[PDB]
Design a protein around this ligand. Structure first.
Ligand SMILES: *[C@@H]1O[C@H](CO)[C@@H](O)[C@H](O)[C@H]1NC(C)=O
Ligand SMILES: [Ca+2]
Length: 496
């Protein structure tokens, strides 16, 4: 459960938030594979509730109605097609598994679902699964409202409804089998792993029982005995009775402290500085690197919908975001997940965005296709951060330095730091309000290297900044606090 099952050489996965299966299949062949991406995290592929008030919000996909591969992203055929095409090109697929609950208890009964399946939240009836009142822990929850009221009580956090969402009785073998049946269907189709959504709201023991019912990966693409990659979405910022270490026996865990702290440091909040990132990782109280799934932002907290708060950096903070993602991709800690979003009409009223529910670009509810512009960027409101030169090139940077140790650290006691990865890579950052100009030891072989942030290595030449490393590995770096991108990165594969 701890290995991503990515092809040797690929070290990152990208979350193609709300993308259609057909668009992802194309992206796998035309960009992800050639650019060295390891895999893709997809939005929940199972039938969810269709909400028209607000109009088709992004969170409607977190309210399951059944386990039918029928959503706004596509049907089972298109989904199968996407997994096959991506797998055939070396790009894995990871599914966001929503197994802690079903839809809201206050949702209207009827056929307002993405595939027409009938459901009755009030009577706890989900015939398409099927599930009934006996499969929920309404009689197990001990709070007066039936919802989670206090997170200081690990019990109610697991047996009660998360903001009204009907809570599945995961201790029952029947429920465990129905969920495994859904996950095994996906595994036999070709998916390499899963993201267990709302894992904090499930008992580590119940998760284990389910995982024990899962098949090995499809022997047509993976070696015999391959187990699905598992990363549990646990929001643990400390101070709670529930700890993400309690889930180590099931697989990896999402480290939400990673993005939150990285945001405050890059933003220079609370007097924090980049020079403090010297012992970044476990030294900061994070989970062990071999159990961590890291990211700068996620679909939740990028819209103030998740842990991290106002410190979280997103595509809206383009300049600082690129630097944050760059540091993450260059640093050896954990397995990295890159975010890919869409734009929405942010509208802050009282310091709050009242349009944080807006779903993906669409035409009367039908998700718009991902169009590629002549400059490789995207249109139709898709941000496509994974296509940004600075991010795409750093994804490759991580692949090239995979396995290399962290060394040659340098910092000016403020916000000007630099470090390398063995003898395969070097990166420099300038987040101070003044220019940076100094000769640093890169530990790199002599030669001329192309800066992969400002440019590219094309046809035995660089389109951006060029760095000259001497015989003793020293090189001069010059970064003005006015540069579009305040950081420079070079590696073995960007050498001329
Ligand atoms: C690099 O570009 C210049 C023209 O700008 C040209 O003289 C040179 O041959 C190019 N080098 C290679 C290896 O193509
Ligand atoms: Ca629960």
């Amino acid at each position: 459960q701890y290995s991503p099952n990515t092809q040797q050489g690929r070290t990152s996965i990208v979350h193609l938030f709300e993308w259609r299966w057909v668009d992802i299949a194309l992206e796998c062949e035309r960009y992800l594979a050639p650019k060295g991406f390891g895999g893709v995290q997809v939005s929940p592929p199972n039938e969810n509730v269709a909400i028209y008030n607000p109009f088709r919000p992004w969170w409607e996909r977190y309210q399951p109605v059944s386990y039918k591969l029928c959503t706004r992203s596509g049907n089972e055929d298109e989904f199968r097609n996407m997994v096959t095409r991506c797998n055939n090109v070396g790009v894995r697929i990871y599914v966001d598994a929503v197994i802690n609950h079903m839809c809201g208890n206050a949702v209207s009964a009827g056929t307002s679902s993405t595939c027409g399946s009938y459901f009755n939240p009030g009577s706890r009836d989900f015939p398409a699964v099927p599930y009934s009142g006996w499969d929920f822990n309404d009689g197990k929850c001990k709070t007066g409202s039936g919802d989670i009221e206090n997170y200081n009580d690990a019990t109610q956090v697991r047996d009660c409804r998360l903001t009204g969402l009907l809570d599945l009785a995961l201790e029952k073998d029947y429920v465990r089998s129905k969920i495994a049946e859904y996950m095994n269907h996906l595994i036999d189709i070709g998916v390499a792993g899963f993201q267990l959504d709302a894992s904090k709201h499930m008992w580590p023991g119940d998760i284990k029982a389910i995982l024990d019912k899962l098949h090995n990966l499809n022997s047509n693409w993976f070696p015999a005995g391959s187990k699905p990659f598992i990363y549990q979405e646990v929001i643990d910022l400390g101070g709670e009775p529930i700890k993400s270490s309690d889930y180590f026996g099931n697989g990896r865990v999402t480290e939400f402290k990673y993005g939150a702290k990285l945001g405050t440091v890059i933003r220079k909040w609370n007097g924090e500085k980049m020079s403090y990132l010297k012992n970044w990782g476990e030294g900061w109280g994070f989970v062990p690197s071999d159990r961590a799934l890291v990211f700068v932002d996620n679909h939740d907290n990028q819209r103030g919908h998740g842990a991290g708060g106002a410190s979280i950096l997103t595509f809206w903070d383009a300049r600082l975001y690129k630097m944050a993602v760059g540091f993450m991709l260059a640093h050896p800690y954990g397995f990295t997940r890159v975010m890919s979003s869409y734009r929405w009409p942010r509208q802050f009223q009282n310091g709050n965005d009242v349009n944080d529910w807006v779903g993906p670009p669409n035409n009367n509810g039908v998700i718009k296709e991902v169009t590629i512009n002549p400059d490789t960027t995207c249109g139709n409101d898709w941000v496509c951060e994974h296509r940004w030169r600075q991010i795409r090139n750093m994804v490759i940077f991580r692949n090239v330095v995979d396995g290399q140790p962290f060394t040659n650290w340098y910092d000016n006691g403020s916000n000007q730091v630099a470090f390398g990865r063995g003898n395969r890579g070097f990166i420099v950052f300038n987040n101070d309000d003044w220019s940076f100009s100094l000769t640093l030891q890169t530990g790199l072989p002599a030669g001329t290297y192309c800066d992969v942030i400002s440019g590219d290595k094309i046809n035995g030449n660089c389109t951006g900044i060029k760095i000259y490393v001497s015989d003793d590995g020293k090189a001069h770096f010059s970064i003005s606090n006015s540069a579009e991108d305040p950081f420079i990165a070079i590696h073995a594969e960007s050498k001329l």
